[PDB]
Design a protein around this ligand. Structure first.
Ligand SMILES: [Mg+2]
Ligand SMILES: [Zn+2]
Ligand SMILES: [Zn+2]
Lengths: 468, 1202
RNA sequence: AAUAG
């Protein structure tokens, strides 16, 4: 019924109900719960804790930034040193009781659980958060690729029987070798490929010391946590799309269209949802308005002009316009550049620079004068063109130079030709001109001087004199 | 170099192949250094260096490093013009539908996918899902799912089916189509179909599908994945004075596209909610649509100037587009313009050209001659000499222009006589001097007119100017063959004054030895110019066979007539001069000189006539004065009588005897009769005078009144204008058109009062506005005609056809409207002209009918002949010389290579501005209608026979009672259907009434085979048919205007040709315009160029397909040579616009109008243009295949054959 | 737009 994308966007946005305070706190709690599940999943990894420990080891040595290590502390280097020393001590304890007493022994589980509790009271920077997520993601994906290759090669029920615990164990390989079903001849042939596949698997498992069941459980927990956090974040964004529109309504007619401002504000809103904190007690609009404003205005600064102006110069231009408008109100006439310079505490030359670099390009379809069928682009010359008189003069000069050179000794003519590039692709210095017959810079220089002296004689220079 | 232009869809790989790089940022230039930014819209790494043989680094900065790519920057060391040729590309994050293949109705995507456009937009606008792979499910491809339904069936089935939304869905649907399978399915369904609507739909879709299969195009290429980017120098960002920059709107559109694409990529990287991603995809589609065609999808995107941005479609299309502004017409060098004055001393081949203007125009020639003769050592010295204006430069200029023809042009150029070549004569001044005798050709008068001048450079152009375009070659009108250099105004007046006769003038009755002694008597004041004398005249007569008979005899004449005989060329009778010479008489003199003596004699005679006329108009002293307007004394009495009788009629109205309408009508008739009587009395008083003769008596003499002489001679003025000067202005009309009862009873000599002047202004304003608007209407009509007929060239000599048209004198009542001689002059006989009542072949086949054979036809009383026509020509391309006949502008048979279609279109279009039973003879009666034949056997009365004194063959004596111009021409040439067309008999058979079904009635006809054909007739129709009557095919059942299409269907090609020609000629002859019928026949031939196939046969033609007739004829000839079933067709009549748009070449069709439709159809079809017509070769810069270029093209057609 | 043809 309509074609305007604006109206379609409002139809799609209106179908989402607006949140309340309780709803905002509930959604924020769900986001935090998902992030906590992901953090717990990453913590149950032999490679994760040593990385944090060595990062703290470098930080406490006053060699690395503290902000890059951690961003906050969960409360239900005055303090960071104590907590990280506790973390180091408990990691030592867990490594002591990880395998000596038994993996199923209560020590290895209780220590890990309280390590999870300790790590839950940490707020890491999102950068190394994604860094740790990516490694396990890649490992799990490689496991998926190898498993799907194995399934494609073998293709069933026999694997399903022994997928639970013997997916990567050599017992499955031995039992397949023992099997004598009619299709197991080709399966035994493919066992050579499966051998290399599982040999590649062995390195990754010892890198994790978790076999297959543990990594599958960690992957499922992480996937569930990320899905839950993503759903909550999407709900918040869809709730606040209307706030994005209300903010973006005020920056129309500044080089960008309405939907562009809406989309930039939406990106700002997503960034705000990524870093909201409901413990502070403020409502979501208060924090999100700043980020939506920033995104929209940075987008205007970067994409509203055919010739891009840097952000600092954009601010200078805007504040010049504001000061000029206040001074116009103050004195009743346009502010001259020196008065503006004095009020800006900047040089007048800088003011003039800002003044002429703050003009948008004119359109080539703009009519000239009072006409309406005329266009500016119809009156623009091609200043790069060469006049035919100049081309004819160049051809005449070439002919005259050839005739003059023909009246000289072949050696001098060739030397001058090489030294000036006539009838040649490149010009040459005295060295390679000497390289012709006798490599002599002082000699080549003398013969060039002689040639110029003879060409300067009025007897054989009246033809070339007319070209000056 | 190239032999054809090929159009088609562009694949992503092809667009990538065109590209020299990928545009990744919307940056254009730095704001300080003004240098191109890397990976931007102006990147030097993609499009080329900004300075010749340099890089942005400045490291490689000479020709020594040509072709070397700098490692620091990446800019190739080459020329800068490469930035006009190098293209780029954008890798779109999501597929985008092409707006032309989506919304240019009919939609190609919808037609191919057999889904309505609304559904396609719903899928595109992310409102509805569509199934791509149905899988093992009841779902079918192309069936729409709402989000609710999609979620439901996603839970129900899972991954069995794939459903998508957007342009990706349409691309997947188009990619999965099996084109041969669809073609087979439509063919099978067309075999077993009866409804004509579904037949039309399947035939259209089948045409599209098989075009796609044949062309090699893939349907999914209609959805864009890679977007090409125009070279920067075609969308320049250039500095203006003061630091301002001028830019093209394409930069704004491209920046929008790039920004939205980058935002889409960033949103997909951030894993945004689906609503935001859908929004961004909608915006990307909108931006690409705006870049391609702004305003087609919806609200046009506007810039900061609050006006819509100009897109690529606007670049290529429209009156201001590239085709018409820059390709079909151009600004040229070696050209000038100035005001035109009159040179009465010039010769017909000469034009006065200013010295400074010639110096600027012929500058390279002057440089060349200065260098050649050693006056200038170099070209710069020559430039200095020319700038200093030395005398030797003037001598060089004279030697340069000595025999160099120059082309003079005046806008508007309505016909080819608007450009003519002259020999320039250098004159001091700033105004061009134009020969008077050519002004009528140019429609040029000296009230502020300006002319343009062009210098032909090469030898071929100079010889074309001398041989074809020179004014002495063009003295006949190509539209009618009549002379176009006929003298006018003062010339005529002078020739009128010198040849008049006066009673009892000085020197009457004198005997003169010849013209020389008449001149001597005039110069000695012995005899007046108007003295009746006897002069010895030696007259030479050149007969038709060439016999030259010289007779000397004494003739009664005047002094002026002999003095004028002094300049008449030998070979003409003295009777052409022994009369008073008005415009018609001088026209006859020139025509006889051309017909009996040739071209050189005619040119010399015209020059001498114009000299003599000017001289004796000067010597006459003819002047206009207030006493020359003689108002008759009867005017006041007539006005009084009319007023009194009007008062009587008003009294009768007050008595109720007559109604108001009767009163109005009879008052108007009263005043019209009064105006006629006053005009007659004024003319009678002004035309005659009384003189005393030699005997002393009173004799009546024709008046020498200046106004009477001006009007009677035809110099200027008519009867109506003299009426207005010295009689009554008459009844005037209101703005709507009604006539005001009281007329203007004053003339311009007495002066009008305020009311009379206001009434006059009412009509003056209407006339001026009508002229202003009809100018544009006529221009559009002429352009359409030129487009439809531009391909018609005389390609052969004889096509070897026996067909022809039947020609008879035009009878529209009791008198001949036009003679058979005027119709037959210049046409080639198709069937032997046997003498009536005899078997002697008077005129054989294939003989041109000239004046001699026209006299032969007239003498032997021949009524009907048969002649070759362009409509009946059998040539595969163009026409042949015999079917065309005489070239009216040249007088002989038309030459091969003559572009007769352009001549026809110009001939018809030029006069568009001027555009707005009792027997009377003795003979026998013949019935066919009613015809009254004379004793000689010629039909001289053609009368209707509504459904009589004398029966068939009964002789009848004399007196026995046997009992909106220009719109009309445009509607005739557009084959428009009348509002209430005549119902014609579809088939021959017996009429029978029928069941009067409610709403409108039905009738039936029984054919010779007994089959019943049912006809559907509206209620309000005065049927002329009666049951039991065998109405012939084409017989009128209900009266009304006849549709030309019905005429073609039921009567044939000859009938529709005669209908169109007769109606157009009626419109033109009402206004007195003489245009030959062969031009109209050429246009009608271009109207009859398509045929719909009724029987498929075995040839590669589908039933119900509109294809070119020439292709069918060639295929039928080949199949007959192979002895196989030929195709059967019905010829179609198209309007000139539709015929122009349905030509074979897409270059011409795109250049005409509707560029988007033509280009879209050609692209989907994969058309190939062979460049066979004039417009294509004009656009590509090649020689046109007509005239001097004709032979050239023929040679190429040989080399391709070998 | 205004003006000339
Ligand atoms: Mg004029
Ligand atoms: Zn470089
Ligand atoms: Zn022919």
């Amino acid at each position: 019924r309509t074609t305007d994308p604006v109206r379609m966007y409002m139809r799609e946005m209106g179908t989402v109900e607006l949140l309340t305070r309780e709803g905002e706190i509930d959604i924020a709690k769900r986001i935090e719960d998902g992030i906590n599940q992901v953090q717990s999943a990453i913590a149950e990894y032999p490679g994760t804790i040593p990385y944090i420990l060595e990062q703290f080891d470098r930080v406490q040595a006053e060699e690395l930034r503290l902000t890059d290590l951690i961003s906050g502390f969960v409360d239900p280097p005055e303090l960071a040193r104590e907590k990280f020393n506790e973390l180091r001590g408990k990691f030592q304890n867990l490594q002591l009781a990880v395998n000596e007493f038994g993996r199923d022994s209560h020590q290895a589980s209780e220590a890990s659980d309280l390590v999870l509790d300790i790590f839950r009271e940490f707020r890491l920077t999102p950068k190394q958060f994604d860094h740790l997520v990516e490694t396990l993601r890649t490992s799990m994906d490689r496991v998926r690729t190898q498993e799907r290759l194995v399934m494609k090669a073998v293709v069933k029920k026999s694997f399903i029987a022994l997928f639970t615990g013997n997916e990567s164990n050599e017992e499955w390989l031995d039992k397949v070798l023992a099997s004598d079903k009619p299709y197991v001849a080709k399966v035994r042939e493919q066992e050579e490929e499966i051998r290399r596949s599982i040999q590649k698997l062995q390195m990754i498992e010892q890198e994790t010391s978790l076999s297959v069941e543990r990594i599958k459980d960690i992957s499922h927990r992480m996937s569930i946590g990320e899905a839950k956090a993503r759903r909550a974040k999407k709900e918040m964004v869809e709730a606040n799309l209307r706030l994005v529109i209300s903010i973006a309504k005020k920056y129309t007619n500044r080089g960008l269209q309405f939907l562009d401002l809406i989309q930039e504000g939406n990106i700002g809103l997503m960034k705000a949802v990524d870093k909201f904190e409901y413990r502070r007690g403020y409502k979501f609009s208060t924090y999100a308005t700043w980020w939506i404003r920033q995104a929209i205005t940075r987008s205007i600064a970067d994409q509203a002009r055919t010739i891009r102006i840097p952000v600092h110069m954009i601010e200078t231009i805007n504040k010049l316009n504001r000061i000029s408008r206040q001074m116009l109100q103050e004195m009743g006439r346009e502010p001259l550049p020196e008065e503006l310079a004095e009020r800006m505490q900047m040089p007048e030359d800088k003011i003039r620079k800002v003044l002429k670099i703050a003009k948008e390009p004119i359109s080539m379809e703009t009519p000239i004068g009072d006409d309406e069928d005329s266009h500016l682009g119809d009156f623009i010359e091609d200043t790069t063109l060469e006049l035919p008189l100049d081309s004819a003069t160049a051809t005449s000069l070439k002919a005259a130079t050839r005739d003059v050179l023909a009246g000289l000794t072949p050696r001098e003519a060739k030397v001058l030709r090489m030294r000036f590039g006539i009838d040649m692709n490149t010009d040459h210095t005295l060295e390679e001109v000497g390289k012709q017959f006798d490599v002599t810079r002082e000699r080549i220089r003398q013969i060039e001087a002689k040639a110029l002296r003879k060409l300067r004689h009025p007897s054989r220079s009246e033809v070339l004199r007319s070209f000056l | 170099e190239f032999d054809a232009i090929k159009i088609g869809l562009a694949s992503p790989d092809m667009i990538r192949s065109w590209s020299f790089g990928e545009v990744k940022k919307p940056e254009t230039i730095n704001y300080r250094t003004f240098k191109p930014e890397r990976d931007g819209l102006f990147c030097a790494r993609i499009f080329g260096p900004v300075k010749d043989y340099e890089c942005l680094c400045g490291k490689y900065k000479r020709l020594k490093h040509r072709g070397v790519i700098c490692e620091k920057c990446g800019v190739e060391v080459t020329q800068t013009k490469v930035r006009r040729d190098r293209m780029g590309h954008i890798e779109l994050a999501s597929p985008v539908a092409h707006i032309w293949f989506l919304k240019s109705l009919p939609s190609r995507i919808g037609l191919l996918m057999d889904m309505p456009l609304r559904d396609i937009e719903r899928v595109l606008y992310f409102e509805m899902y569509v199934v791509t792979e149905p899988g093992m499910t009841d779902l079918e491809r192309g069936q729409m799912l709402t989000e609710e339904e999609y979620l439901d069936r996603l839970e129900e089935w899972g991954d069995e089916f794939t459903a998508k939304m957007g342009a990706e869905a349409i691309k997947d649907l188009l990619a999965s189509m099996d084109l041969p399978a669809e073609a087979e399915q439509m063919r099978e369904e067309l075999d077993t179909t009866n409804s004509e609507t579904k037949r039309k739909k399947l035939t259209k879709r089948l045409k599209l599908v098989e075009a796609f299969v044949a062309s090699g195009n893939k349907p999914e290429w209609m959805i864009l994945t890679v977007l090409p980017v125009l070279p920067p120098d075609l969308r320049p960002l250039v500095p203006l004075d003061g630091g301002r920059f001028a830019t093209s709107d394409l930069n704004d559109l491209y920046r929008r596209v790039i920004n939205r694409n980058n935002r889409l990529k960033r949103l997909l990287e951030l894993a945004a909610p689906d609503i935001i991603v859908r929004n961004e995809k909608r915006m990307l589609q909108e931006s690409v649509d705006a870049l391609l065609d702004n305003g087609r999808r919806g609200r046009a995107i506007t810039g900061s100037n609050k006006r819509p941005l100009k897109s690529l479609a606007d670049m290529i299309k429209g009156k201001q587009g590239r085709f018409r502004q820059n390709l079909l017409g151009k600004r040229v060098d070696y050209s000038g313009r100035s005001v035109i004055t009159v040179g009465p001393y010039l010769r017909l081949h000469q034009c006065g050209l200013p010295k400074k203007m010639a110096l600027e125009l012929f500058k390279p020639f002057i440089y060349s001659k200065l260098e050649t003769r050693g006056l200038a050592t170099t070209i710069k010295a020559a430039k200095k000499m020319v700038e200093r204006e030395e005398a030797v430069v003037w001598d060089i200029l004279d030697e340069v222009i000595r025999e160099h023809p120059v082309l003079l042009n005046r806008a508007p150029t309505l016909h080819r006589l608007g450009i003519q070549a002259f020999e320039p004569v250098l004159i001091e001044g700033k105004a061009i001097q134009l020969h008077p005798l050519v002004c009528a050709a140019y429609n040029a008068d000296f009230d502020g007119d300006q002319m343009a001048v062009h210098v032909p450079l090469t030898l071929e152009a100079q010889l074309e100017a001398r041989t074809l375009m020179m004014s002495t070659n063009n003295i006949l009108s190509p539209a009618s063959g009549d002379p176009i250099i006929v003298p006018s105004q003062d010339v005529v007046l002078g020739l009128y004054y010198m040849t008049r006769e006066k009673i009892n003038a000085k020197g009457e009755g004198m005997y003169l030895t010849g013209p020389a002694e008449a001149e001597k008597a005039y110069r000695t004041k012995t005899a007046e110019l108007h003295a009746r004398v006897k002069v010895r005249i030696t007259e030479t007569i050149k007969h038709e066979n060439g016999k030259l008979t010289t007779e000397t005899k004494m003739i009664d004449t005047t002094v002026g007539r002999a003095m004028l005989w002094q300049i008449v060329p030998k070979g003409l009778p003295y009777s052409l001069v022994n009369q008073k010479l008005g415009k018609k008489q001088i026209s006859n003199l020139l025509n006889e000189a051309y017909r009996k003596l040739g071209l050189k004699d005619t040119v010399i005679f015209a020059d001498q006539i114009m000299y003599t006329g000017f001289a004796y108009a000067a010597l006459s002293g003819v002047s206009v004065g207030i006493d020359d307007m003689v108002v008759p004394a009867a005017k006041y009495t007539e006005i009084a009588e009319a007023e009194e009788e009007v008062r009587e009629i008003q009294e009768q109205f007050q008595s109720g005897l007559v109604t108001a309408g009767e009163r109005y009508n009879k008052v108007i008739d009263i005043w019209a009769s009064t105006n006629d009587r006053v005009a007659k009395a004024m003319m009678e008083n002004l035309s005659s005078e009384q003189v005393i003769n030699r005997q002393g008596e009173q004799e009546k003499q024709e008046s020498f009144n200046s106004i009477y002489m001006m009007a009677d001679s035809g110099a200027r003025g008519s009867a109506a204008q003299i009426r207005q000067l010295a009689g009554m202005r008459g009844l005037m009309a209101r703005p709507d058109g009604s006539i005001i009862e009281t007329p203007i009873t004053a003339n311009f000599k007495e002066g009008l009062n305020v009311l009379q002047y206001f009434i006059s202004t009412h009509g003056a304003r209407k006339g001026l506005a009508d002229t202003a608007l009809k100018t544009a209407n006529s221009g559009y009509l002429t352009r359409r005609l030129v487009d439809v007929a531009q391909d018609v060239v005389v390609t052969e000599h004889d096509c070897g056809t026996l067909e022809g048209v039947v020609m008879t004198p035009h009878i529209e009542g009791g008198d001949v409207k036009v003679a058979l001689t005027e119709l037959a002059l210049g046409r080639v006989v198709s069937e032997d002209i046997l003498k009536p009542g005899t078997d002697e072949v008077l005129i054989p086949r294939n003989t041109l009918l000239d004046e001699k054979w026209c006299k032969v036809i007239n003498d032997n009383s021949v009524d009907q002949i048969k002649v070759r026509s362009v409509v009946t020509c059998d040539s595969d391309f163009g026409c042949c010389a015999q079917c065309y006949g005489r070239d009216l502008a040249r007088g002989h048979l038309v030459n091969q290579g003559e572009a007769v279609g352009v001549i026809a279109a110009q001939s018809i279009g030029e006069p568009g501005t001027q555009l707005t039973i009792q027997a009377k003879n003795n003979g026998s009666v013949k019935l066919h209608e009613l015809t009254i034949i004379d004793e000689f056997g010629r039909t001289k009365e053609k009368h209707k026979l509504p459904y009589l004194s004398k029966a068939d063959g009964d002789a009848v004596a004399a007196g026995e009672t046997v009992a909106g111009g220009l719109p009309r021409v445009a509607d005739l040439f557009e084959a428009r259907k009348p509002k209430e067309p005549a119902i014609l008999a579809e088939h021959s058979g017996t009429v029978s009434f029928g069941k009067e079904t409610k709403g409108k009635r039905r009738l039936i006809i029984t054919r010779d085979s007994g089959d019943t054909y049912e006809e559907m007739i509206p209620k309000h129709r005065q049927l002329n048919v009666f049951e039991g009557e065998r109405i012939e095919r084409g017989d009128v059942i209900a009266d009304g205007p006849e549709s030309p299409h019905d005429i073609l269907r039921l009567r044939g090609i000859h009938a529709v040709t005669t209908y169109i020609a007769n109606e157009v000629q009626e419109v033109y002859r009402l206004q007195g315009v003489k245009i030959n019928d062969k031009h109209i026949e050429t246009i009608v031939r271009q109207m009859l160029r398509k045929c719909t196939i009724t029987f498929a046969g075995d040839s590669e033609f589908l039933p119900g397909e509109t294809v070119e007739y020439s292709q069918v004829k060639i295929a039928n000839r080949k199949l007959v040579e192979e002895g196989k079933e030929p195709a059967r067709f019905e010829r179609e009549l198209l309007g000139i616009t539709k015929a122009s748009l349905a030509t074979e070449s897409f270059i011409s069709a795109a250049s005409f109008q509707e560029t988007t439709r033509v280009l879209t159809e050609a692209a989907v079809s994969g058309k190939r243009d062979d460049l066979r017509g004039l417009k294509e070769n004009v656009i590509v810069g090649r020689l046109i295949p007509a005239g001097t270029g004709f032979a050239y093209h023929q040679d190429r057609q040989a080399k391709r054959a070998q």
